[PDB]
From a paper:
Nucleotide-sugar transporters (NSTs) transport nucleotide-sugar conjugates into the Golgi lumen where they are then used in the synthesis of glycans. The [name] (CST) is one of seven types of mammalian NSTs and is highly selective for transporting [name]-sialic acid ([name]-Sia) into the Golgi lumen as well as for transporting the free nucleotide byproduct of the glycosyltransferase reaction, [name], back to the cytoplasm. Here, we describe the discovery that an endogenous methylated form of cytidine monophosphate (m5CMP) binds and inhibits CST. The presence of m5CMP in cells results from the degradation of RNA that has had its cytosine bases post-transcriptionally methylated through epigenetic processes.
Numbering used by the authors: 9 to 317, 321 to 330
Write the structure that this text describes.
Amino acid sequence: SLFFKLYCLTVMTLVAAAYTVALRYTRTTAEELYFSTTAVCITEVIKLLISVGLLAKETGSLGRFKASLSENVLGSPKELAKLSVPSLVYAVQNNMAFLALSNLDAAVYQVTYQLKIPCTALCTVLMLNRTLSKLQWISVFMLCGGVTLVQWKPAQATKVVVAQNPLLGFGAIAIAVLCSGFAGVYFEKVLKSSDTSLWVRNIQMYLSGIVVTLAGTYLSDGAEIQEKGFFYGYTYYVWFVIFLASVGGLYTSVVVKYTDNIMKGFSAAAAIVLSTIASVLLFGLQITLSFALGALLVCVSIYLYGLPRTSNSLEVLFQ
Ligand SMILES: Cc1cn([C@@H]2O[C@H](COP(=O)(O)O)[C@@H](O)[C@H]2O)c(=O)nc1N
């Protein structure tokens, strides 16, 4: 149990960090530029395949595996229909991430996208029948400022050789921020509404996710893809991004299961701070004054959020 939590967070933290800069890299240095829509779609395919394997391991046998697929996919059309909503919303979110990093510096993206933290807290209280004390709300905005400081970097020195539309990038992030809170909390509500396996829920969602993301690939880029090919512009780094997005999505679902969507934001900030401090001590990595102050705010916000809060009996007695 202890090791699984350590492996989930160090995987989450290395993947999320590497993901943004690697994605930015692939969008700015290529001559032949791949279709972002296709990478989002292939990510859904990989997550489905890994989730299927994890369900086989969890069920423990081919017969129990087949039985679970039959009851929970073939036999649960309403669950498939419900989870099509976050699949639609996530298809937009993940495509907006590529659009934004095509047009903005990674650090500009990272700071702005942290607005998902208060968004996700609001979605949580509105959709999950939960409350936050006034002190907890303070801690949520404190966390947001802390991670903003943690992520604040000087702009990259490399000159960009492709056209950029930063305003389009900011519009993309604004959409992604709204998507992040709504789809994550929607998935959480479905997951915690029954004892159905996490891996069943992921399979249920990725099935519609593959359909929606491929349809979006067709509608956005179908004509140019018939000309250039679906995998036009793919490189080792494009696959690296897809792999990172796949692992990151799977571990996101795990963190939501064992904690919640608000704790996800606190735990990711703690992991970024601790892994950065580890790299200072192990490798002499240099940090900024912004990071140092943000780290303290992250620490205080975690402390404040966990402090002990009658006015929420419906919350604690039934979920
Ligand atoms: C909840 C959930 C999210 N995801 C993915 O995890 C990511 C969540 O990103 P954010 O924490 O920035 O919203 C998205 O890329 C989404 O597609 C997933 O793959 N499976 C899930 N069950």
